[PDB]
Amino acid sequence: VSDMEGTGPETGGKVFDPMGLSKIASAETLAWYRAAELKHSRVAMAAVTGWAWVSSGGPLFPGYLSVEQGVTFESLGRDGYAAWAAVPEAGKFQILGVIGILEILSESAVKPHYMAGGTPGKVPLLWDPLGFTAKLSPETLARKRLAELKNGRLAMIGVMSLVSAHFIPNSVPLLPGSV
Amino acid sequence: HGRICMLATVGYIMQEFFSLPGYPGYTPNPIEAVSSTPPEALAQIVLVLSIIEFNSNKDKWTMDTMFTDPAREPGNLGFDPLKFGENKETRERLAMAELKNGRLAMIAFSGMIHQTFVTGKPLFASLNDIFSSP
Amino acid sequence: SAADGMEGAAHETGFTTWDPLGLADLGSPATLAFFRHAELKHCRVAMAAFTGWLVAVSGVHFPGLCSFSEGISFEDISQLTPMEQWGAVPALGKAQILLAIGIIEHQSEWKIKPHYMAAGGKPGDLKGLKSFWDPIGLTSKMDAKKLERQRLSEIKNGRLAMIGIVSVLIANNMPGAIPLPIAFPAGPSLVLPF
Amino acid sequence: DYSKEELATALNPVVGYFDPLGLATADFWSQGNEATWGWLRHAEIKHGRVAMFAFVGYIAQYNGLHFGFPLSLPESPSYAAGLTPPEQWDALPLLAKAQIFTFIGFLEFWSELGMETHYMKGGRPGDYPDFPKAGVIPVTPVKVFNLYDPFGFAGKRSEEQKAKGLLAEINNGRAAMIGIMAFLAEQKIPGSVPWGPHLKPYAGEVMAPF
Amino acid sequence: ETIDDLKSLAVKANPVVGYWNPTPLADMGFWGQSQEATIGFLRHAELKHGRVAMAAFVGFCLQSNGVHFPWACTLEGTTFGDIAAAGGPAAQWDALPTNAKLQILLLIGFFELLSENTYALAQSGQKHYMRGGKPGVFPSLKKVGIPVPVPLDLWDPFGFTAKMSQEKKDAKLVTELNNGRAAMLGIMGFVAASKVPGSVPALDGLIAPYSGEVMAPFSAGDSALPFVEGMLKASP
Ligand SMILES: CCCCCC(=O)OC\C(C=C=C1C(C)(C)C[C@H](OC(C)=O)C[C@@]1(C)O)=C/C=C/C(C)=C/C=C/C=C(C)/C=C/C=C(\C)C(=O)C[C@@]12O[C@]1(C)C[C@@H](O)CC2(C)C
Ligand SMILES: CC(=O)O[C@H]1CC(C)(C)C(=C=C/C(C)=C/C=C/C(C)=C/C=C/C=C(C)/C=C/C=C(\C)C(=O)C[C@@]23O[C@]2(C)C[C@@H](O)CC3(C)C)[C@](C)(O)C1
Ligand SMILES: CC(=O)O[C@H]1CC(C)(C)C(=C=C/C(C)=C/C=C/C(C)=C/C=C/C=C(C)/C=C/C=C(\C)C(=O)C[C@@]23O[C@]2(C)C[C@@H](O)CC3(C)C)[C@](C)(O)C1
Ligand code: KC2
Ligand code: KC2
Ligand SMILES: CC1=C(C#C/C(C)=C/C=C/C(C)=C/C=C/C=C(C)/C=C/C=C(C)/C=C/[C@@]23O[C@]2(C)C[C@@H](O)CC3(C)C)C(C)(C)C[C@H](O)C1
């Protein structure tokens, strides 16, 4: 655990594992933890950015989510859980199915699997299509991996803050009462 | 028998669901569908299979007549277009698999036939009726 | 597996042969060559089938009459659903379409003497039937590298196209299969010849 | 004959060789790249020549330029007024258009026949042969004046001055092709050539002769 | 041009700030091309953006006041005064005639074609910018050899920077880069003031408002062109 990334100056330049969860972890278990942490970081970053953009009165998509069923993006609600509920069930089904095909492809198509001697939480299938970090130096890439992990953990905290604000009426101090 | 019945089981299960488009005398119950269908269809099928058997076992229709030549192997009627048998490593696997699947298919076809006799409904309809509510 | 030197390993399966059930290990290199040739034929036929299906759905049709004896026209055939068009074609028209396809198949088996199953087969290779594939020499400008890239693109597009034609032909008959709610055209998923 | 890049550089240095379809490197009918390149060059030259001819004819006859001959004795149907040039061709009697096509067919047939071997088989693209000597065609008691230089104003020029004319012919032919298609597109589809002329709204498939 | 050359240019431009490049664009390989190709593309893009904004800032300033031409466009009669009275400069543009817009755009396309043509650039004496050439170069419209000659070139119409010294010309290219950056910010400020009111604090209440999409070259009046009426309706 002491050789992995994620540690920063903000915890003594040291590991943060108060409850010993890394001491019962082999190399494969640590790889699984890192893969789960990174995927949660990715999902939470996308989720919190989308929730903030939607519920902060940001721009919405132009027209009809379903031209036949009659659902405009404006009429969806501009509220996270309500908008997700108002999305058609077919739309949710195909979003989840596309994500599932991507997950199966990720598991079956990234050789040296992350649990068999591969990099945890890397997807060569979905990263830098254009050119962005295919030419960066191996120290700036590590720095940006550390940044990814950091603000991804922050995104986890933020998205669960939004969820708690929605369910618990006013649980977050500086968030509205109708999340 | 194994080859015939492992064709027959697939035919039995898929005749309940699928039909030739607009084929006369279809019935999901294949037992009734035999009588329902035109006799000429079954006559042509039996004629084609008679031609196949005759040409494949020319002068070898009997215990004494067949297997006179030492190279003749049981079941090796020369039917292997895709040439799976040229790979000798998997030949034992495929032979054992043919034998076991043919045996299971003989038993299975007997099961489907007699279950349809018992119930009067096609195979998966009877299966649903078994695995339905009390 | 035996399907290691064979082209077809993609970007979406790592860069390793995708044979989960190990069928390439089954049988002979002749059997694997048959599998490759069947794959490419299904690929090509599926691309043609999806393009024709889009043509039928769009309603674009040739100007004229299919048969002056029966009086059936391209417009009257276009009125039906895409799969019902085949039933609407004249019987002799279907017969001679199948005759042309059968002649092409027979020449592919015959005139390409180093056979796909045989040694040195080149299973995807149907060029040799002169002026059949690429009559305009469009592939002549390319080199070996671009030709390999375009062969891989053929394989990918064709696999996707056969999945697509199965999807569109099974969507309406099997509702809820393809999640996108749109009025897929009616008609049977399978039709007989003649 | 001319290499493709050499010909393209001579025609237009800014463009040079341009062939996204790669038809210059094609093999039509399995006849070989040289033969097929000759075919393509001769097709380009023929299309250009026909386009120049038809463009001068279009500008001439769209301004009601009817010949002084009465043509048809009952009435020249296409010399009537209120007629776009495509409608004039349509209004011509079927025998007239038939005879025109048989004449053009004789010209094409003799073009293909009289060759060194052929424009495909190592022959100069676009070279219309000299009509035969005398009497070697049915009838022809006197001679047939050559379709190229009937009065023999071709020995006037020198070899390089003929190569220059050939390149100018190809470029002008490309421009004339574009011009005729602009005219016809403007006729059928109004405003398709917004910066070109405003022609009458003729509505007929030009690709139907009869 | 290497990153060392980019740094030297940045130092010459702004001695205090210097080379600022938070982006990776100078490091990526654009379209699978090389470092030199990517840097040439970015530098020529910067120079063209600069130049166009420098030209268009003056255009916006003059047309908004009203310095419209005294003559008249389309023969039926809608003078440049009428186009000016249509509104502010974006309103003037989207009120222009369809053919006028298309002629302007396709002349610009012709100039871009000649600018990226190997033959014209080679005749003027320079290579393509992504293939080891000086960014910002526009070839002579004389040496290209149009069948009918052209009197004057685009750059150096009358040779005002004729002779000079190349060290001087590079020093003035530094001026070009800085002025272009400032002009791009200025025109985007003008257009932002036109559309989003109060977006540019200094120019609030000084720039005429606007509602059309500045990123839409053709208007509803130009719906005759294909796929334009639907696109106007589909504007964000
Ligand atoms: C935008 C497209 C531009 C490309 C196309 C183009 O420009 O089209 C232009 C175009 C039409 C048009 C348009 C306009 C309306 C005018 C303008 C608009 O333009 C815009 C908007 O931009 C639209 C456009 C282009 O549509 C048409 C062009 C037609 C063309 C080019 C027609 C050539 C006939 C030559 C003949 C008959 C010569 C016989 C010559 C003969 C018989 C000889 O004696 C040969 C000779 O060798 C001999 C034997 C001996 C030698 O001693 C030398 C000579 C020479 C004596
Ligand atoms: C997710 C969901 O719910 O739904 C999704 C998924 C689902 C259900 C699967 C769906 C579907 C159907 C799909 C995706 C169908 C895909 C069909 C596909 C992919 C069809 C390819 C045809 C290619 C042809 C005909 C190419 C010929 C090309 C030829 C003959 C060439 O000459 C090529 C050429 O290179 C040469 C050789 C030489 C060059 O010199 C010139 C060019 C370049 C021209 C949906 C409903 O649509 C959407
Ligand atoms: C909002 C707030 O609170 O604050 C601010 C922010 C905000 C909005 C950004 C503002 C703004 C706008 C700004 C700053 C706009 C900047 C505009 C800028 C900087 C525009 C340059 C054009 C240069 C040209 C056209 C030169 C051509 C020159 C050429 C082609 C020559 O002839 C020169 C020449 O020497 C050569 C090269 C060769 C020599 O032989 C001689 C000659 C003469 C031939 C405001 C208004 O400040 C308010
Ligand atoms: C990332 C996920 C994703 C992908 C990759 C993806 C791809 C494709 C492709 C190409 C491969 C096609 C051809 C296609 C077509 C349609 N999509 Mg789909 N789509 C995704 C997501 C959603 C969502 C969220 C919705 C949706 C819908 C529709 C409708 C319905 C129109 C209507 O009924 O008016 C049609 C025709 C909406 C829906 O079904 O609403 C009931 C809807 O809400 N899609 N979609
Ligand atoms: C593989 C493609 C193909 C080829 C290469 C091909 C070649 C030739 C040749 C030259 C060798 C001749 C001389 C010829 C003649 C006729 N073809 Mg034919 N044909 C092809 C396809 C179809 C289809 C799809 C149809 C069709 C038909 C007719 C009829 C109408 C008869 C009528 O009035 O009934 C006549 C006279 C229609 C038909 O059979 O209608 C019952 C019809 O639908 N063909 N066809
Ligand atoms: C060994 C082997 C293999 C095997 C095997 C397997 C799986 C074999 C399985 C055989 C199996 C499964 C054999 C069932 C027989 C059932 C019978 C006879 C039922 C009679 C039922 C009767 C007579 C019912 C009568 C009644 O209903 C009537 C008519 C009316 C009611 O009033 C009264 C009752 C209910 C009594 C492999 C693996 C395939 C290959 C390998 O190489 C070799």
Side-chain angles (χ1 to χ4, degrees):
Chain A
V1 74
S2 46
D3 309 9
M4 299 211 299
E5 302 184 9
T7 59
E10 305 98 30
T11 63
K14 274 142 64 157
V15 190
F16 169 70
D17 167 323
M19 330 201 322
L21 268 66
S22 61
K23 312 203 211 317
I24 68 170
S26 94
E28 309 191 11
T29 304
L30 285 158
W32 176 260
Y33 287 164
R34 175 59 68 210
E37 173 152 53
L38 284 163
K39 206 184 299 199
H40 280 82
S41 280
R42 314 247 171 81
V43 173
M45 278 188 285
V48 69
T49 37
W51 210 329
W53 185 279
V54 166
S55 309
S56 314
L60 248 51
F61 277 115
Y64 267 95
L65 176 58
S66 192
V67 160
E68 324 282 345
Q69 208 159 299
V71 199
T72 77
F73 289 109
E74 301 305 346
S75 59
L76 256 179
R78 240 191 194 172
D79 165 38
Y81 270 110
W84 187 243
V87 159
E89 284 287 327
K92 303 203 282 270
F93 274 25
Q94 57 211 253
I95 280 161
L96 298 165
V98 166
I99 285 158
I101 279 157
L102 281 177
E103 290 273 67
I104 289 156
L105 282 161
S106 75
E107 293 273 309
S108 63
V110 308
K111 295 332 300 193
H113 201 239
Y114 53 93
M115 280 267 272
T119 294
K122 83 165 290 215
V123 198
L125 278 59
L126 323 173
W127 180 243
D128 296 339
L130 314 183
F132 290 119
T133 76
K135 308 285 176 57
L136 261 70
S137 319
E139 71 289 21
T140 182
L141 278 160
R143 222 176 78 159
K144 285 192 191 73
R145 280 195 291 283
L146 175 58
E148 187 194 357
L149 279 162
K150 283 196 197 167
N151 38 51
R153 295 153 169 176
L154 186 66
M156 306 203 199
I157 286 156
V159 66
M160 300 298 318
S161 78
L162 287 158
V163 169
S164 58
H166 174 273
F167 284 114
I168 316 307
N170 191 349
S171 42
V172 176
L174 154 72
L175 221 50
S178 308
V179 172
Chain B
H1 290 105
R3 297 154 183 175
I4 291 156
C5 297
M6 89 180 120
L7 287 174
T9 47
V10 188
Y12 208 101
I13 66 190
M14 300 197 33
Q15 264 153 69
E16 149 166 38
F17 302 121
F18 309 102
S19 85
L20 264 68
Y23 192 83
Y26 173 109
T27 290
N29 190 3
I31 302 302
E32 154 167 352
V34 162
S35 73
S36 188
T37 40
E40 312 101 299
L42 303 159
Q44 283 164 106
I45 288 154
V46 168
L47 214 166
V48 170
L49 300 172
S50 290
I51 287 154
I52 290 154
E53 278 271 70
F54 187 87
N55 283 249
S56 65
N57 308 117
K58 198 82 80 80
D59 315 316
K60 285 139 163 44
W61 307 294
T62 315
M63 269 155 189
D64 44 296
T65 50
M66 192 164 38
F67 301 117
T68 47
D69 186 81
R72 183 68 156 71
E73 303 297 340
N76 196 313
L77 305 180
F79 177 56
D80 196 355
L82 271 51
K83 311 194 186 135
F84 288 78
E86 283 182 317
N87 186 64
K88 318 310 302 172
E89 293 112 305
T90 53
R91 164 53 88 147
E92 173 57 19
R93 185 189 163 191
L94 296 170
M96 199 49 157
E98 191 185 41
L99 210 69
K100 290 203 182 195
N101 279 291
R103 292 156 165 172
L104 176 59
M106 291 185 277
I107 299 151
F109 192 70
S110 323
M112 330 199 156
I113 288 280
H114 282 105
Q115 160 157 220
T116 49
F117 291 157
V118 166
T119 52
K121 333 195 209 79
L123 194 70
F124 275 68
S126 58
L127 193 54
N128 292 354
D129 289 26
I130 296 155
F131 288 67
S132 183
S133 200
Chain C
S1 309
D4 273 357
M6 279 212 155
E7 201 194 346
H11 301 250
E12 303 89 316
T13 55
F15 278 86
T16 51
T17 308
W18 186 55
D19 189 1
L21 305 180
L23 272 84
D25 319 319
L26 256 67
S28 199
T31 300
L32 188 66
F34 188 90
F35 289 179
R36 170 54 57 179
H37 194 206
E39 186 203 284
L40 286 163
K41 254 161 187 190
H42 288 106
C43 277
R44 296 156 184 167
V45 172
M47 316 190 193
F50 204 77
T51 323
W53 179 88
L54 288 164
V55 156
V57 169
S58 287
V60 65
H61 70 84
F62 283 111
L65 270 45
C66 296
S67 59
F68 55 82
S69 94
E70 276 112 314
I72 218 77
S73 189
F74 296 105
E75 171 299 311
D76 325 289
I77 288 152
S78 199
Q79 300 313 90
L80 303 105
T81 67
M83 286 299 313
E84 283 161 19
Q85 302 200 347
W86 196 247
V89 176
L92 275 91
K94 294 191 276 183
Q96 58 202 298
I97 289 160
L98 267 78
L99 176 53
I101 289 158
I103 290 155
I104 293 152
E105 293 272 47
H106 184 284
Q107 297 337 285
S108 83
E109 300 305 276
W110 186 22
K111 307 307 207 177
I112 306 297
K113 182 45 56 177
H115 204 68
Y116 53 89
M117 300 212 50
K122 300 164 273 291
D125 197 87
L126 255 75
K127 66 200 200 98
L129 312 179
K130 273 139 183 163
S131 321
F132 175 49
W133 159 249
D134 178 46
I136 5 177
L138 302 185
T139 72
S140 309
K141 71 210 186 201
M142 313 167 178
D143 53 314
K145 194 172 321 312
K146 183 137 191 93
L147 282 161
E148 220 188 19
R149 189 268 191 201
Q150 297 276 133
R151 279 200 295 286
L152 182 56
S153 160
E154 187 198 34
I155 295 164
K156 283 197 173 59
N157 270 290
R159 299 160 159 165
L160 165 62
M162 58 175 86
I163 287 159
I165 194 75
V166 171
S167 83
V168 302
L169 296 176
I170 210 84
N172 193 258
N173 301 62
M174 201 169 294
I178 286 72
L180 330 171
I182 46 174
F184 281 108
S189 37
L190 272 193
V191 295
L192 301 163
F194 319 129
Chain D
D1 59 87
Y2 274 139
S3 178
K4 61 192 201 176
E5 294 105 321
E6 298 275 22
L7 180 59
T9 290
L11 261 46
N12 192 300
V14 153
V15 179
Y17 177 67
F18 183 59
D19 184 3
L21 286 168
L23 291 178
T25 58
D27 195 12
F28 307 148
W29 320 287
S30 189
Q31 283 289 346
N33 249 306
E34 171 46 51
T36 64
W37 173 245
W39 167 268
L40 282 152
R41 272 191 41 64
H42 188 202
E44 185 164 38
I45 295 166
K46 196 170 276 175
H47 279 100
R49 285 172 183 170
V50 174
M52 309 165 205
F53 198 68
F55 190 79
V56 191
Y58 204 102
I59 66 179
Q61 78 188 73
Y62 195 9
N63 306 353
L65 187 65
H66 316 134
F67 283 146
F69 318 125
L71 184 39
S72 304
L73 281 192
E75 71 296 317
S76 42
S78 311
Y79 291 9
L83 265 160
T84 63
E87 292 287 331
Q88 293 200 272
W89 174 261
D90 203 338
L92 279 181
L94 299 170
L95 298 170
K97 300 134 75 163
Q99 279 179 97
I100 287 155
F101 290 154
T102 70
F103 178 41
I104 296 154
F106 158 74
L107 294 175
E108 293 275 298
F109 171 83
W110 181 244
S111 69
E112 298 279 308
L113 206 157
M115 282 276 158
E116 75 84 24
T117 317
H118 214 57
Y119 51 88
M120 301 193 49
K121 300 220 170 156
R124 184 132 61 162
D127 198 313
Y128 197 89
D130 162 79
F131 277 125
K133 164 69 211 91
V136 183
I137 270 173
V139 193
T140 317
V142 202
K143 195 239 177 303
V144 192
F145 304 145
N146 298 319
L147 185 52
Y148 191 59
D149 51 73
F151 311 140
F153 307 136
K156 294 279 179 58
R157 323 307 297 155
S158 171
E159 161 174 19
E160 282 70 7
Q161 298 177 1
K162 326 211 77 144
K164 173 150 72 72
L166 255 164
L167 305 170
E169 148 168 87
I170 293 170
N171 297 278
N172 280 292
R174 291 169 185 188
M177 286 188 242
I178 299 287
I180 283 160
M181 290 307 134
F183 279 20
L184 301 172
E186 198 45 61
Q187 288 222 320
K188 191 111 176 178
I189 319 303
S192 36
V193 190
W195 303 345
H198 273 209
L199 324 169
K200 292 211 276 217
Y202 153 70
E205 278 74 7
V206 190
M207 313 309 285
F210 323 107
Chain E
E1 277 162 311
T2 52
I3 315 100
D4 159 10
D5 316 80
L6 279 158
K7 284 170 179 175
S8 57
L9 173 46
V11 168
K12 293 167 198 181
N14 204 167
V16 168
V17 174
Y19 182 55
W20 217 169
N21 190 49
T23 72
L25 303 178
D27 154 37
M28 320 175 19
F30 282 24
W31 317 282
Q33 303 289 323
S34 86
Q35 220 80 7
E36 298 277 89
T38 303
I39 272 164
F41 188 82
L42 298 172
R43 284 222 59 248
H44 201 308
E46 187 163 44
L47 292 152
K48 220 190 264 170
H49 278 72
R51 293 159 171 187
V52 176
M54 313 207 252
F57 185 80
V58 180
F60 206 104
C61 292
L62 294 169
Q63 302 170 186
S64 277
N65 279 355
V67 185
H68 72 82
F69 258 85
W71 323 112
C73 81
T74 47
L75 293 294
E76 68 63 22
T78 51
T79 68
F80 304 103
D82 319 63
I83 293 294
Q92 301 177 58
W93 171 263
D94 58 11
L96 282 167
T98 302
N99 280 0
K101 294 183 185 172
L102 289 176
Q103 289 172 83
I104 298 162
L105 294 183
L106 297 194
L107 180 64
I108 296 155
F110 180 71
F111 291 168
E112 298 266 33
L113 191 173
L114 293 187
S115 77
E116 286 215 335
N117 197 243
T118 50
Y119 176 82
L121 284 175
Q123 288 286 319
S124 304
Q126 329 84 10
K127 285 189 172 189
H128 192 260
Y129 54 93
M130 287 197 8
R131 300 278 170 267
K134 186 168 68 182
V137 174
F138 189 80
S140 298
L141 297 178
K142 272 202 302 188
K143 306 180 194 182
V144 57
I146 293 175
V148 161
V150 155
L152 322 173
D153 287 335
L154 201 68
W155 180 250
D156 321 300
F158 302 90
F160 299 152
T161 187
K163 304 165 183 156
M164 272 187 69
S165 296
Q166 200 55 288
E167 51 86 10
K168 200 171 180 183
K169 276 200 276 221
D170 294 330
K172 322 235 95 182
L173 287 176
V174 177
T175 310
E176 162 166 317
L177 201 73
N178 305 1
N179 279 97
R181 290 155 170 179
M184 301 145 58
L185 299 172
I187 197 185
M188 289 317 263
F190 276 2
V191 177
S194 69
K195 194 119 183 197
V196 187
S199 63
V200 183
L203 311 177
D204 190 328
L206 199 79
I207 309 304
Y210 189 57
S211 55
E213 187 66 13
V214 296
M215 313 309 278
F218 311 115
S219 76
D222 303 15
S223 268
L225 309 169
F227 299 165
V228 164
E229 62 291 319
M231 272 175 158
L232 264 285
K233 297 149 171 175
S235 166

